[PDB]
Amino acid sequence: ISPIETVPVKLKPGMDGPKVKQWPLTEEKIKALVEICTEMEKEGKISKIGPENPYNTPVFAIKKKDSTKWRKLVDFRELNKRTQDFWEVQLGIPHPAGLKKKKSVTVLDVGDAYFSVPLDEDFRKYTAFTIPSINNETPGIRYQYNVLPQGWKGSPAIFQSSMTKILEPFKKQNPDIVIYQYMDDLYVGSDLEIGQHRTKIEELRQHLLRWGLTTPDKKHQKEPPFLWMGYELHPDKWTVQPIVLPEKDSWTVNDIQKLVGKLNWASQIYPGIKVRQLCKLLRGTKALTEVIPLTEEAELELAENREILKEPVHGVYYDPSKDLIAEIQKQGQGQWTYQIYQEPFKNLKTGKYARMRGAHTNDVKQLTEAVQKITTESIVIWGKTPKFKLPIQKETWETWWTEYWQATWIPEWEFVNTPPLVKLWYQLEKEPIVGAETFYVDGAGYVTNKGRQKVVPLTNTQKTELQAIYLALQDSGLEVNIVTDSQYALGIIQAQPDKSESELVNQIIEQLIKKEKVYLAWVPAHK
Amino acid sequence: ETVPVKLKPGMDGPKVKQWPLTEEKIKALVEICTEMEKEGKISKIGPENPYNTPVFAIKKSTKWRKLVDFRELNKRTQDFWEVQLGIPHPAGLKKKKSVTVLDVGDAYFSVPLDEDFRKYTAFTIPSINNETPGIRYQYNVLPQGWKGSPAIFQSSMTKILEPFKKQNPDIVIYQYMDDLYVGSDLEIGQHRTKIEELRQHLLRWGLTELHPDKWTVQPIVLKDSWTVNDIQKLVGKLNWASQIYPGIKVRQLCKLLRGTKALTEVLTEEAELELAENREILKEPVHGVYYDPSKDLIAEIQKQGQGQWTYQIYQEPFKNLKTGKYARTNDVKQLTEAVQKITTESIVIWGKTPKFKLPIQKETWETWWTEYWQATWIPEWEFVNTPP
Ligand SMILES: N#Cc1ccc2c(Oc3ccccc3OCCn3ccc(=S)[nH]c3=O)cccc2c1
């Protein structure tokens, strides 16, 4: 408390301190509030202030959780708005996969920490609250916060900085002990045997006590397994908390949102979770009371998902010496399940790469994006890119890489043999074919060097051109050379979408999946 | 004595977020920053300072170095500085025979910095798996890579380079963001000797090879077989270049196509003078393009494949100021080296460093530019690409 230094805090430039009027309260509320405030003043958390200070933040009395007693909550929206923006506390929880196995791990939750770390003298004035007096006889009793208030914008950042400053000398003196910190709690882990570990944790508690932060007793400390942010941290395995899917017959939009969230959360350890059809249902904006029927495809998806969730799965903590290995599998169209395992059949983390909504791309391009996403998440969690294992053949990758127009790279990878195998369905040639029927199209007919012609009744109202490009394929034969008036059709065909999202692309692909040589060129519109 | 440094009126400082980095890079950054703090160049900051600026570690040599991405703070200050304190650009550097970049980034680690401006230069070293909050820092000495550093150190640089420039009037020296450009029309060996002399000069005063003449604009070329496909290709390219050059017309060649025909054929109507003459209309470089001092340079990189990359620097579209063809290893590496060469040529020709329309995708460049970067400056690249 006393040794903990004060961080300079000031209001935003050009803004005055909060000034709010307190509304009258009930007689039991005011008596409970004055009792609690007097107890705090005895403890020194708050100090009475004179009438010269015009800053006031309203107070509200709420029944304590499962308690008839009326705890005190002070609103801080105004002062939060009028405060210098502090550095945000890190919003990403540590992933249990990146943790390294240690012989003993203890959970130390610092008690009443925001009331232990003090506050700046200049800023103490604005954090003033008034406890009203009945019958309007007196203005009331005023108080101010000598210590970090709760609900304030800067409480997490200031407390985190103070905790780091306090813990630094202990980390310097003992380097083996690793101390994670998330929210208030301190998570301590050492490779020492339990006999020395209990002594070291007692030493840490004494250090925090001499710096004024209370810690739980030895008996009260939790014992494994630990439940933390939906993760069940066993000694040698980590699993997600038991996930039960709703059996509700009629699903509302909010129910679908919860189901998709639970399935996505379960995907991190459970392999083979598919949520794409449910997300397709969810894309239509609707009221939370709106009831959307379950398509047969979505019902199949939910059936296979609930079948997958029936089995239990576990993950394994990271061991630094061995190298990470990541494997991608294409479960279906637009779904790619990726697994990250140091050793075979011991998965650190499973996941899925959902296809971009409303995007049709070549499966090799989707594979490249999945590889990039794996690289990013691996960097964030472990700090090293994995050695990938991908379905695509090296020759197919080289062909698409050299022909494609962007810059695409993939880290070190090898070829694992498994169905399905991702390959370019049609390799358009970039040179013409002699002795083949030269072919002209227009948005739809076939105008030919042989002399055949045709006409399509264009709707009075470009698809007919795509129809013509399709109509070109079946009319010509095995060896075809076509030219196109518009660049759009050439771009669509050159992107080589094996996605087969639309019916016209479907028929084009079905036609040219067997044609041995099809060369398309673009000839400008002739004036 | 500290000089007053002020942000442009009504603008807040940097608040950008750090992109997560590899464990080896984090370790190298931590050790470098700890050593610098012990020397006194950087000092710790608490949570009262929201401002942030990314940190990346590059390797130039087995010693890691730190590149601090000061693009936003530069946007907010160098504009204020350029009018207040500027660096002129010698026009003779482009005509010099040999030009050398000698890094003088160690000067700015001595002279102090304004107390009020110290807070806007804050950087964090990230941690793996969110184990601990990053060790935040601030710069107490002049930053490296911030365009106000040469402006502040200009007086010292002039007083340190005056004797050498007086001794050698032919040498042209120009400074841009921790880089000194030394140009000499002398032969290459004499240039090496002069650069060694300048390095010894700087070292004794407590201060610690591209060829511009060879560069020239790229010619553009535009059918004895008269293959109908080649005639279609020529009419397409001529219709494309119609915007760039007003002279070229493809009407007669269009008549040569004459509609429906078979693809492979062996024919010239009114001869083919048009092909030759339009080749002439192209051989002469574009006319009517002049540098505009108050506009941004944007460079488009186009991937022609086969280890080839064509770039076009242009103030206004369809009026190129310079066209080239870089010829080269992964595609990300090729793009990195292409960007570096393009902007170094831009620096030696005109003052500015171009904005880039990179062909690569956003997250891939974000992930893989740091490994292959080897230059102190950082251009304002645009990840998104226009399909070429
Ligand atoms: N509730 C809660 C809770 C408890 C401990 C956590 C945690 O502990 C470590 C702390 C420091 C180093 C390694 C750690 O963990 C290694 C792996 N590990 C994990 C568990 C067990 S019982 N044993 C073991 O070795 C790190 C992060 C979050 C934590 C949350």
Curated annotation (Swiss-Prot), chain B:
Result after altering residue 377 to L: No effect on RT p66/p51 heterodimerization
Annotated effect of mutating residue 373 to L: Decreased RT p66/p51 heterodimerization
Effect of residue 146 to F: 10% loss of DNA-directed DNA polymerase activity. 22% loss of RNA-directed DNA polymerase activity
Reverse transcriptase domain: residues covered: 39-210
Residues that coordinate or bind Mg(2+) 1: 103, 178-179
Resulting phenotype, residue 178 to A: Strongly decreased RNA-directed and DNA-directed DNA polymerase activities. No effect on RNase H activity
Effect of residue 381 to L: Almost complete loss of RT p66/p51 heterodimerization
Effect after changing residue 60 to R: 10-fold decreased sensitivity to ddATP and ddCTP inhibitors
Effect of residue 149 to A: 74% loss of polymerase activity. 56% loss of RNase H activity
Substitution effect: residue 177 to V: 58% loss of polymerase activity. No loss of RNase H activity
Phenotype upon changing residue 60 to E: Strong decrease in RT binding affinity for all dNTP substrates and in catalytic efficiency. 100-fold decreased sensitivity to ddNTP inhibitors
Result, substituting residue 179 to E: Drastically reduced incorporation of phosphorothioate nucleotide. Loss of pyrophosphorolysis (reverse of the polymerase reaction). No effect on RNase H activity
Effect of residue 282 to S: 31% loss of polymerase activity. No loss of RNase H activity
Site description Essential for RT p66/p51 heterodimerization, residues in chain: 368, 381
Effect ascribed to mutating residue 180 to R: 20% loss of DNA-directed DNA polymerase activity. 21% loss of RNA-directed DNA polymerase activity
Phenotype upon changing residue 179 to N: Loss of pyrophosphorolysis (reverse of the polymerase reaction). No effect on RNase H activity
Position of sequence motif Tryptophan repeat motif: 365-381
Coiled-coil residue spans: none
Effect of residue 103 to A: 5- to 12-fold decrease in affinity for dTTP substrates. Strongly decreased RNA-directed and DNA-directed DNA polymerase activities. No effect on RNase H activity. Loss of pyrophosphorolysis (reverse of the polymerase reaction)
Effect of residue 372 to L: No effect on RT p66/p51 heterodimerization
Effect seen on changing residue 149 to T: Complete loss of polymerase activity. No loss of RNase H activity
Outcome (variant: residue 178 to E): Strongly decreased RNA-directed and DNA-directed DNA polymerase activities. No effect on RNase H activity
Protein name per UniProt: p51 RT
Organism: Human immunodeficiency virus type 1 group M subtype B (isolate BH10) (HIV-1)
Gene behind the chain: gag-pol
